[PDB]
Symmetry: C6
Subunit: 96 residues, 6 copies
């Protein structure tokens, strides 16, 4: 199925991790950020599952922004996040 | 009616079950100290979702654990069970949702 | 007005009544289920009113799924639910 | 502006008033021990809804009991009163909403 | 950007101020009502800012109705509300 | 990706900051007893918003105070700082959101 966006932020600003719900509140004992947004819970769950299986990342949760839009969020080392999001995108596109 | 998506994850990663509301929080068992397969049917329609969910639990030894609401009219029915049961369940649920008018 | 779906489940699975908000939690002292989904609160209310007037069913409530979508839910004996949902559909289609 | 729906139910069933948020829960009266008619104007627009609601209560002896939000920008204004008052109120509310720009 | 609606109610009914969240609950010690609805938070904020700068009105808040729709609400004397909403509409249309 | 809107208000009225969740409630300062400029990037996409927000705070001396969710998939990233910083920040955020795929 169609994906809205697949993106990697290798070194997020500390202000982004503090202000936004991305699983790495500064001070809670700088991971790369990977995100996959899908207009589809089923596609987002498959992408999330493929992400955590493809590389050493953690699924921290998901963002619901209404209208059917959900974003799976993973953190980890930059290379791992890149590998995960690539795998997650391919998995979501296979859903159908 | 039209189904948004139908999908089975045979062996969901433990992180998925820990982080998402899919009815099988790791550690929530009497023998916790191999996860169930995961079936999902997504419809832009509560009525089609309910019908899909009813068909799924009548078709196979799966547990309907709840549904997910993402807004915009979109809802997902979530079932858990053994791999083969979940595949049979979601096939029947897809067919039942196709019949809703 | 246009209706999204009109449907009857004559004998719902006990798991559906336990997991979903359909007014018959198992154990709270197997009714048929009738549902009418409308992209319109006004049309849903008219359908609900016509349903409970047309046959012996109870309106248990309604589901809001966003984007303007609402579903009226009624329970009762199978024949009554069929009669109600038929009446509710005709009533909602007359709204305009 | 465009109105989604305008509608009067002269004598809503008591089950409707008991189960839906339409401002007249059965039994909530000083002489409870015949229900008001029900007018509703639905707009994909809060501004048109407010204007409709204001026109309705200025046009007739009806009570605006609240509004219903179903997402997607959709809102419904709900008035209660005698049948004839509600019919006059909703006609004026429809006309007023048609004038909003 | 496109505005959904710009409207002024010179003398709202007391029932409208009591039943709806428009910043003038009757009894909390009859202001005109001005509203600007935008399918866009950014456009609504610019309109709101232009409104309170253009005339003697108060921004009382905003209504979120889903689907991206937000409505800024201002109160004041009729002439002030008219001047404000005219200014707010022009400001929102300039956003782009 | 497509950006819904990008906009700077150099000197937001105090009533705006008092009534809307824009991160600068009047009086919430150690020397309260001139307001920061306001930058906003709106996307129908959480991912584009996050990228926009990250670019904004890396590009200039602005504070990301939060984001606004209006449903339908729409979200707005909100930054506060001096006028010139906010203009530079939002320009970079717009460019970064344009690169998201």
């Amino acid at each position: 199925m169609e994906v809205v966006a697949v993106h990697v932020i290798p070194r997020p600003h500390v202000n982004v991790d503090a202000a936004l719900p991305l699983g790495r509140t500064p001070g809670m004992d700088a991971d790369a950020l990977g995100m996959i947004e899908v207009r589809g819970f089923v596609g987002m769950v498959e992408a999330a599952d493929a992400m955590v299986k493809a590389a050493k990342v953690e699924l921290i949760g998901y963002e619901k922004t209404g209208g059917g839009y959900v974003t799976a969020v993973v953190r980890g080392d930059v290379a791992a996040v890149k590998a995960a999001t690539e795998a997650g995108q391919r998995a979501a596109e296979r859903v159908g």
